[PDB]
Amino acid sequence: EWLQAEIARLKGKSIVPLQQVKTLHDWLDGKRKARKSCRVVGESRTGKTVACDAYRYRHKPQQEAGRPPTVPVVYIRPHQKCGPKDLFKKITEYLKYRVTKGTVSDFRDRTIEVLKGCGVEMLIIDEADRLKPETFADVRDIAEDLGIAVVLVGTDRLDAVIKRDEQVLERFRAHLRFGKLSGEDFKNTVEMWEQMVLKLPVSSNLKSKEMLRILTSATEGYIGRLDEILREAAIRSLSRGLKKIDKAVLQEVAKEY
């Protein structure tokens, strides 16, 4: 069934090249050469994770012979109230080694051995504010001891946590900020959702002024709402049998907010 093939396409996920993703990859390439620690900040629906995942899918692990994988960029995400053993455990697993029973000093000594030899240049920590305050001692230690850049990713709350400690606030002072879409940039992006993500049977013409007013009030410039509103509208359109989105069906979806 032709309809079923397309409904399975819309509920999925994709990475679209955008100016914010492209900016971050240029900036992180500057930090990875310089071995400088930094942080990435911005509001919760701006797409900081997808922009970092696209950077983890560049710079793939180089496998050779029977040596350990050469991993330039390590990306981890901590669990809530992450302790010192939880950080090492995840670093060790991501590099594909098994963790066994021991004490804190052992996870630490072992983490430094697998970080050596195996070619790490950058460590990216998502949701950095799940870290317990003491673990930052181990994050700084690595950054200073090994030529490894550490990147902390998070929301404005992260900085509220960081400002509680001078020692950390100064290693990670450099930052890049993710913003919201507006003006020509929001309008141009709506065409990319239409012509590259949705690909509906005939064109909905979402760049038209009345569809932009509906979309602007709905999305508030967040790429994580634009991706959500338009899938919800396109699924509703196709499962009701429409070849495109229209004023009333998009207002039905946007009224859920």
């Binding site: 996920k13 994709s14 990475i15 995942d53 496998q63 990319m192 590259m196």
Partner: peptide, 14 residues
């Protein structure tokens, strides 16, 4: 332009 399926990037990743 190329637009990536999110599950495909997972299948291709090391």
């Amino acid at each position: 332009i190329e637009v990536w399926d999110y599950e495909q990037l997972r299948e291709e990743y090391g």
